[PDB]
Amino acid sequence: TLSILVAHDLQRVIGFENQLPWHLPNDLKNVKKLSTGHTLVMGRKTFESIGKPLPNRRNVVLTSDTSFNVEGVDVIHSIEDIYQLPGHVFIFGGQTLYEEMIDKVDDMYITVIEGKFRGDTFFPPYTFEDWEVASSVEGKLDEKNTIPHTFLHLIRK
Numbered sequence: 806t807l808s809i810l811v812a813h814d815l816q817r818v819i820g821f822e823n824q825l826p827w828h829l830p831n832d833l834k835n836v837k838k839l840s841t842g843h844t845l846v847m848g849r850k851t852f853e854s855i856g857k858p859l860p861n862r863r864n865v866v867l868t869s870d871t872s873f874n875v876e877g878v879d880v881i882h883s884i885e886d887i888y889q890l891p892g893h894v895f896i897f898g899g900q901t902l903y904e905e906m907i908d909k910v911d912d913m914y915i916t917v918i919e920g921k922f923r924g925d926t927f928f929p930p931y932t933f934e935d936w937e938v939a940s941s942v943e944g945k946l947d948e949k950n951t952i953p954h955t956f957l958h959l960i961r962k
């Protein structure tokens with residue numbers, strides 16, 4: 806399976822100055838749940854902002870940099886390389902990866918952040934005419950998660 810994994814706000818903002826615009830532990834928890842034991846594919850900028858591979862899953866980084874060789878990370882240099890990765894592969898961002906892959910993935914796990922943040926990077930526009938809502942779950946708010954959010958699983962029609 807090839808899946809997109811993303812959190813975007815009401816205007817499809819996904820990032821600002823190479824960081825997430827919001828603080829949402831429940832979403833990080835869900836990312837961990839979804840991707841542990843599987844594969845994350847991310848663009849070079851997204852990887853550098855995280856700064857190290859995420860534990861207990863395969864980390865794959867797409868870059869044109871022939872010098873890229875980071876411990877605990879597998880490097881690929883072409884979009885086509887993604888299709889050779891075994892198992893459940895999650896496209897983990899950032900904007901360039903989402904734009905390059907949104908027309909190819911099987912399904913999308915999207916956390917809709919119900920706010921309007923300042924952003925400089927975006928998830929591409931999409932229509933629910935193309936995607937079935939397999940599930941939609943309101944995130945629980947608390948002291949540490951204070952922005953309303955909804956977990957979607959969308960499957961291509």
Ligand SMILES: NC(=O)c1ccc[n+]([C@@H]2O[C@H](COP(=O)([O-])OP(=O)(O)OC[C@H]3O[C@@H](n4cnc5c(N)ncnc54)[C@H](OP(=O)(O)O)[C@@H]3O)[C@@H](O)[C@H]2O)c1
Nearest residue numbers: 811812819820823824848849850851868869898899900901
């Ligand atoms: N909200 C979310 O769910 C989420 C998730 C992930 C990321 N983000 C955000 O997304 C933003 C970053 O997105 P971005 O578009 O600026 O960068 P990005 O997609 O993370 O990385 C871009 C880089 O990926 C490499 N790349 C992409 N396509 C390639 C291809 N076909 N062949 C070879 N290399 C390729 C290139 O690296 P080289 O220049 O090294 O060749 C390119 O410069 C950040 O703000 C981050 O916080 C948000």
Ligand SMILES: CCc1nc(N)nc(N)c1C#CCc1cc(-c2ccc(C(=O)O)cc2)ccc1OC
Nearest residue numbers: 810811812823824825832833836854855897898916
């Ligand atoms: C966790 C935010 C997020 N949510 C969803 N639903 N899908 C995604 N693809 C990403 C993402 C991402 C990239 C990213 C992750 C992290 C990050 C932070 C904490 C944890 C963790 O505690 O597990 C994991 C990833 C940090 C920066 C960063 O880019 C700036």
